[PDB]
Amino acid sequence: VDKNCIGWAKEYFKQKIVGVEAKKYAKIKSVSSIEGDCEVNQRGKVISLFDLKITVLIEGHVDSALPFEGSINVPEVAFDSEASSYQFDISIFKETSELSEAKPLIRSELLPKLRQIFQQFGKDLLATHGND
Amino acid sequence: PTKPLWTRNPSDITQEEYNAFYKSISNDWEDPLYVKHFSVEGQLEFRAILFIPKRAPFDLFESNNIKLYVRRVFITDEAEDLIPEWLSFVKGVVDSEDLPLNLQNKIMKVIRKNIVKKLIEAFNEIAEDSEQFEKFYSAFSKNIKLGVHEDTQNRAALAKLLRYNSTKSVDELTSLTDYVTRMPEHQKNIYYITGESLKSVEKSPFLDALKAKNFEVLFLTDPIDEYAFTQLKEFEGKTLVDITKD
């Protein structure tokens, strides 16, 4: 028998993602959306060809100091993704020549922690509904 | 009787067998530019032999390139969703072990996404050979740009195949990667300018200040490129900046 773990994946990412963070600094505020599929089917084995789209909202500051907000879209978190597979579309809302230091921040310290999290999900997913 | 070519091991197949198989399914009179024959195993099982033609077909973006088999039984040669339209020029065969017969299908989506990734690996191999890439680019550069327009997951990789003239690449087109290598460590953005044609952007006065800083400027002379750039937003960590936005 197969099951749709999209509900579980969605709460899993909410706690795995919110709060992660990178004078200059930023952190993941919320998880604004997760779409796609995530099921664990029995096929010989207990396979899963999950494939998800995820967007997170962010906040931070550079510099006295100057804060900002944005979003990060990852078009594909999937059963066959490698660490280098994930794509990150960094948006800094209503940006300015001064805010030109936010993205380099996010790329250097946040993204690499995002990559390891997505990579762990597959393991956690099966060792939770597969060895099941 | 005949053991289908695509079920055979890529490593054992000769260029001549690939050429004969390509001519057989396409009527082309030329050998294919490149062949990408692979197998996918595991929770998803399928094989494919895909060919990139040496020339664009007369009706590329105007006026059944892939035969879909299921467990070695031919099903159809007109299943869209097997490959996106910007890749419509690819020919060949896809044989799926699992696709359910008679029909949003999940297996089809996985297969499609896997095929797009493999064709991009092929395009990167092609780019490593200037004689081949020249033929590839002159025929399908527009298709590459359309993939950049719509494919959020693969556009960064596709961006590596784009070529443009620049204030430092006047007699040859340059790649974005090479533009980046020529950048001084203090340069943070990749600069480009748009215009109605090469001759006009080439002497635009907005270039003066970039040149005085010795910063290279890419020349984009078509809306399809401008849109490709704003959809990309950045390349290898460097933001794409249009120098006439002010």
Swiss-Prot record, chain A:
Expression is induced as follows: By heat shock.
* Effect annotated for changing residue 37 to K: Decreases activation of Hsp90 ATPase activity and substantially reduces Hsp90 binding affinity
Q: Which domain of life is it from?
A: Eukaryota
Q: Where in the cell is it found?
A: Cytoplasm
Instruction: Using the record, list the residue span of the signal peptide; answer none if the entry has no such feature.
Output: none
Other remarks in the entry: Present with 13939 molecules/cell in log phase SD medium.
Cite the record's note on assembly: Monomer. Interacts with HSP82.
Function text: Co-chaperone that binds to the molecular chaperone HSP82 and stimulates its ATPase activity. Binding to HSP82 promotes a conformational switch in the catalytic loop of HSP82, facilitating the interaction of the catalytic 'Arg-380' with ATP in the N-terminal nucleotide-binding domain. Although not essential, it confers thermotolerance when intracellular levels of HSP82 are limiting.
**Family designation:** Belongs to the AHA1 family.
| Official protein name in the record | Hsp90 co-chaperone AHA1
Protein's organism? Saccharomyces cerevisiae (strain ATCC 204508 / S288c)
Swiss-Prot record, chain B:
Other observations noted = Present with 444943 molecules/cell in log phase SD medium.
Result after altering residue 150 to K: Specifically reduces the activation of the exogenous ligand glucocorticoid receptor
Localization recorded for this chain is: Cytoplasm
Annotated consequence of substituting residue 42 to N/S: Reduces client protein activation activity, leading to growth defect at high temperatures
Its family remark reads: Belongs to the heat shock protein 90 family.
Q: Which organism is it from?
A: Saccharomyces cerevisiae (strain ATCC 204508 / S288c)
Q: What induces it?
A: Expressed constitutively and induced by high temperatures dependent on transcription factor HSF1. According to PubMed:2674684, it is constitutively expressed at low levels, however, due to the specificity of the antibody, this result is unsure.
Q: Which GO terms describe its cellular component?
A: cytoplasm; cytosol; nucleus; perinuclear region of cytoplasm; plasma membrane; protein-containing complex
Task: For this UniProt record, give its keywords in alphabetical order, as a comma-separated list.
Answer: ATP-binding, Chaperone, Cytoplasm, Nucleotide-binding, Phosphoprotein, Repeat, Stress response
Key word Repeat present in the record? yes
> GO molecular-function annotation terms?
ATP binding; ATP hydrolysis activity; ATP-dependent protein folding chaperone; identical protein binding; unfolded protein binding
* Primary gene name: HSP82
From the Swiss-Prot or TrEMBL record, give the protein name.
ATP-dependent molecular chaperone HSP82
Q: What does this protein do?
A: Molecular chaperone that promotes the maturation, structural maintenance and proper regulation of specific target proteins involved in cell cycle control and signal transduction. Undergoes a functional cycle that is linked to its ATPase activity. The nucleotide-free form of the dimer is found in an open conformation in which the N-termini are not dimerized and the complex is ready for client protein binding.
